Design a protein around this ligand. Structure first.
Ligand code: HEM
Ligand code: CAM
Ligand code: CYN
Ligand code: K
Ligand code: K
Length: 405
């Protein structure tokens, strides 16, 4: 389904990649995206899919564009254009310096000191979930751990009832991996309609939860408006309900196939933070982008005002120019180069929370369930979009080889 090639785009730069359904998806989603890094593909290409847009395919270009907000604006950061135009989340839809005071507030509610404060609850929940699954000798990891672990931590931090999880999970899915069942705008509005009365309640009677803190925060010497609070809280919900969930599944899928990697971490758990970084590189999963603020020649390519450019965070660390043998998982790489949490002013506000959840998962799962595998004859399917993911991950193990703590 191909949009007519714009007059300014030369034909040798055309490469019709579909970010929502890449042709090589059966090989794994990262593998499917890595077709953009084969020798037949220029550094910067135009796809006619999804309305037509640029794709930067090398880490150097991706990093440069994320730094240059003057030319590459976050005002319209999603493909297709309809989604990007409807996108108004805070701080992501803002460029510097406007994003700054909102980002500071975001750091207050999902940043480091908050992680350090909730760390006991994070540890508690991982141990509880895993111990409950342990005697079963099987699970569907996506529904049984990857979802409830980070999502329940988020709902705890946000002071939201766990019964709202299915609905919010559906809406966030529609924004990052659309079904066709609803436009981005309709999904976004449903999320907003959920938040609107909660924000008003918590402006009236403030709590100490993330929503209360955002809704009662200060911007530019004045109170945050109910609208601004809604737009930021909406982003926090999307940010809290999708990426870590899907990332955990890619990592656990890998570990299920790699006993030697499991033992490295069990025997020398001080290597776990580096392993976290390497898995974040290899199983990177986000791809959003920017819109051109003006005509601009970038690496020899003429970009036009209003052109969209996908700058896949996923691709920087898979670029062989950034990491040798990029598809190999090597916990001992001297430098794990990646932009998995993004780059520039919008570098993920939740990255500390994400890392903690990952490192807790690695340690606590491998302690109790050191030996496990993918269920016999199970076909693991990945999905692709703004955030890529694992559809289902059936795991099996012999309970006799497990340990309670
Ligand atoms: C492995 C897990 C995660 C990954 C890979 C990831 C990735 C990213 C990326 C690539 C961006 C930048 C998007 C852009 O530049 O347009 C971003 C932004 C953001 N993320 Fe995450 N993230 C993760 C976990 C989390 C968590 C747990 C939260 C908690 C709510 C969170 C909240 C946010 C927020 C609020 C922003 C916006 C920052 C800004 O625009 O200034 N993220 N994330
Ligand atoms: C691209 C993102 C990962 C980043 C945080 C959530 C997300 C889906 C956004 O809308 C901005
Ligand atoms: C961020 N998600
Ligand atoms: K390329
Ligand atoms: K917009």
């Amino acid at each position: 389904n191909l949009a007519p090639l714009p007059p300014h785009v030369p034909e040798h730069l055309v490469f019709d990649f579909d970010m929502y359904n890449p042709s090589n998806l059966s090989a794994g989603v990262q593998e499917a995206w890595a077709v953009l890094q084969e020798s037949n593909v220029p550094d910067l290409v135009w796809t006619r899919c999804n309305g037509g847009h640029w794709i930067a395919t090398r880490g150097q270009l991706i990093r440069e564009a994320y730094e240059d907000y003057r030319h590459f604006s976050s005002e319209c950061p999603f493909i297709p254009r309809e989604a990007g135009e409807a996108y108004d989340f805070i701080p992501t839809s803002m460029d510097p310096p406007e994003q700054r005071q909102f980002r500071a507030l975001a750091n207050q509610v999902v940043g480091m000191p908050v992680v350090d404060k909730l760390e006991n609850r994070i540890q508690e929940l991982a141990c509880s979930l895993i111990e409950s699954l342990r005697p079963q000798g099987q699970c569907n990891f996506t529904e049984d751990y990857a979802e409830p672990f980070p999502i329940r931590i988020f709902m705890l931090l946000a002071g939201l009832p766990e019964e709202d999880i299915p609905h919010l999970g559906y809406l966030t899915d529609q924004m990052t991996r659309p079904d066709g069942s609803m436009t981005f705008a309709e999904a976004k509005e449903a999320l907003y309609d959920y938040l609107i009365p909660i924000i008003e309640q918590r402006r009236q009677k403030p709590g100490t939860d993330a929503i209360s803190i955002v809704a009662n925060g200060q911007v530019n010497g004045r109170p945050i408006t109910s609208d601004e609070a809604k737009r930021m809280c909406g982003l926090l919900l999307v940010g809290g309900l999708d990426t870590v969930v899907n990332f955990l599944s890619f990592s656990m899928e890998f570990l299920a196939k790699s006993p030697e990697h499991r033992q490295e971490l069990i025997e020398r758990p001080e290597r776990i933070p580096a392993a976290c970084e390497e898995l974040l590189r290899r199983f990177s999963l986000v791809a959003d982008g920017r819109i051109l603020t003006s005509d601009y020649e970038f690496h020899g390519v003429q970009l036009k005002k209003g052109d969209q450019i996908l700058l896949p965070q996923m691709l920087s660390g898979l670029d062989e120019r950034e990491n040798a043998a990029p598809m190999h998982v090597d916990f001992s790489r001297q430098k794990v180069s990646h932009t998995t949490f993004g780059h520039g002013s919008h570098l993920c506000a939740g990255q500390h929370l994400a890392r903690r959840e990952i490192i807790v998962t690695l340690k606590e799962w491998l302690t109790r369930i050191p030996d496990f595998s993918i269920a016999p004859g199970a076909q693991i399917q990945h999905k692709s979009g703004i955030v890529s993911g694992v559809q289902a991950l059936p795991l099996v193990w012999d309970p006799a080889t497990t340990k309670a703590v």
